Each structure stands twice: as structure tokens, then as C-alpha cells.
Amino acid sequence: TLPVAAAFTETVNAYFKGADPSKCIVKITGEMVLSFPAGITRHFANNPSPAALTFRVINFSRLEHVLPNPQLLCCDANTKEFWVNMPNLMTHLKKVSEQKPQATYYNVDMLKYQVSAQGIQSTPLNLAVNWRCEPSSTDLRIDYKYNTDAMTTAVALNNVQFLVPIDGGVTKLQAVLPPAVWNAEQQRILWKIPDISQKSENGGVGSLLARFQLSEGPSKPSPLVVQFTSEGSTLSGCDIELVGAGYRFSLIKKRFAAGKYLADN
Amino acid sequence: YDPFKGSDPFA
Ligand SMILES: [Zn+2]
Ligand SMILES: [Zn+2]
Ligand SMILES: [Zn+2]
Ligand SMILES: [Zn+2]
């Protein structure tokens, strides 16, 4: 039989407003990709017509605004079944394998979608930011909480970055914890935490703190921008299954990442 | 954007 791979990739967007959870706007998108090995070139020469490639997406209820690949698809309530169009898949794969003859696999966009999200609960990193703006000074507090409830199974957030612009004419940085980095040319501060999870200190609950001395002042609060990626889980809870013989999954990769992930004062 | 990069799915 032929080996094949799958990938779910979800992007989470959030916007927090000070400490008020009711005001947090959330939007999660996502993409499903099927991948085929180079061998297929020779395999679809020894075969056509090949065995029908049919799959099912599990927990399809959790998805909204679903756009199936128009060249390859779609012409109950929690499960959806798809029969891929084989002639077009083959046409495509032949085109890409002539174009990149020295490629080990070919990725094919199969599904694009939104994920219904219920506010702060659907957010893997809860954030709340507070600014105290003195005429001659500035106090910044960033509270964060790793939230297992947003994700199918509990896994870490990697390469977490907190970036925030400091207006007003910064001069000195005092009382910083944990250590951060000052960009003087861009007048902005950046914290990096490599790993945030339940296995982290305080169970993913923590605070970034900074104090700034102002040459002019006072500062106007600017949006905190956040970055993180995560491997091993979706936000949706969707999986995939093969239906019918001929094909085997060698790997189903699930991952997610912040897109526009912001927090105002 | 490659979801598998750089690891190999068929190994
Ligand atoms: Zn074969
Ligand atoms: Zn059905
Ligand atoms: Zn094509
Ligand atoms: Zn894509």
C-alpha cells in the first residue's frame, strides 16, 4: 500500500483588554494538509486507476466556515467523510514532481477552516496587562497564565516572546524581572521564555515586570504583541482517519501557533 | 510554509 501523511495547523488570534475576560476577542483558523512521498510518481504509473483515497475528519462539529480544496473535493453532525478526486490529485502530483524532481514529499492543501471559539477559555495563553503612567516614570505589569483547557491535550508553548513598545523617551530600565532585552533604536522591550507548560514554574502562571525612567513622558500605552508555537495538539480536537484500503498514515502532525496575539491596557 | 519541515514523514 501507499504511505501518506497529514497535518493540522491552527493559528490562534486573541485580543485582551486590561483585566476584563468579557472583552477578549478570539478567532482561530486552521488548515489541513495531506502529503505524498516521491515514490507516487512511479506508483501512479503502475496503477491508474488507483484505489479511492477516502478519509474522515473527526470532531467536525467544532469547525465553522469550512472551505474544501475545489480541485480535489466536495461535488452528519460530528464526522465528515471525503472522497478525494484522483485524476486531479494525479495531475497535480505529476506537475509538482516534474517541477521539483528532487523533492522527497509533496504537500497538498486539503481543507481550510475556522474553529468556533468561546472567548478567554479558547485561549492557550491568558494575558492581562497593566500600565501605571507617571509624568516622569512608567510601570509595566504583564500577567500570564498557561491554560490547558484551550487545547485537546496539555502540551508546552515554545519560543514565547513578549514584545512591547515604550513611548515617552526612555532613559533607564529599573526593576526588571525576569531579565528582558532593551531595543534602543526601536524603543521597545522584549522578553523571551523558551518553554511554558504545566511542568514550568507555578504551572505556567507568571508575571513580567518592568520600570522605565522618562526623559519627556508620560508614555501612552501601546499593544503588547505575543508569539508562540506549539507541537503535538490542535485547539479544535479534530483528528483524521483513513477509510478504505490502499493507504496508510505514516504520520499525523498536529500543531498550533499565535497569529495576531495582542493585549491592551 | 511546510508543516513537516524539516523532519521526514516517511522514515
Ligand atoms: Zn506502490
Ligand atoms: Zn457523514
Ligand atoms: Zn494542481
Ligand atoms: Zn498551505
Author numbering:
A (entry chain A): 559 to 633, 639 to 828
B (entry chain B): 644 to 654
Reproduce text from the manuscript describing this model.
Src homology 3 (SH3)-domain growth factor receptor-bound 2-like (endophilin) interacting protein 1 (SGIP1) and its splicing variant, SGIP1α, are brain-specific homologs of FCHo1/FCHo2. The μHDs of SGIP1 and SGIP1α, which are identical to each other, are highly homologous to those of FCHo1/FCHo2. The μHD of SGIP1/SGIP1α also binds to the DPF motif-rich region of Eps1519. Thus, the SGIP1/FCHo1/FCHo2 μHD is a domain designed for recognizing the locally ordered structure formed by the two consecutive DPF motifs.
We next crystallized the complex between the SGIP1 μHD and two short μHD-binding Eps15 fragments containing two DPF motifs derived from the high-affinity μHD-binding site, Eps15-640–649 and Eps15-645–654. In the two structures, the two DPF motifs are recognized by a continuous cleft on the μHD. The two DPF motifs in the two structures adopt type-I β-turn conformations, and each is stabilized by two sequence-specific intramotif interactions. In our complex structures, the two DPF motifs are intimately packed against each other through hydrophobic interactions between the side chains of Phe in the N-terminal DPF motif and Pro in the C-terminal DPF motif. This arrangement of the DPF motifs brings the hydrophobic side chains of all of the Pro and Phe residues of the two DPF motifs together on one side, allowing their extensive recognition by the continuous hydrophobic cleft of the μHD. Two conserved Ala residues, Ala563 and Ala565, of SGIP1 are located at the bottom of this recognition cleft. Ala563 contacts the side chains of Phe in the N-terminal DPF motif and Pro in the C-terminal DPF motif, while Ala565 contacts the side chains of Pro and Phe in the N-terminal DPF motif. In the two structures, the two DPF motifs bind to the same recognition cleft on the μHD. However, the positions of the C-terminal DPF motif relative to the recognition cleft slightly differ between the two structures, probably due to differences in the lengths and the amino acid sequences of the linker region between the two DPF motifs. Nevertheless, the key interactions for DPF motif recognition by the μHD are essentially conserved in the two structures (see below).
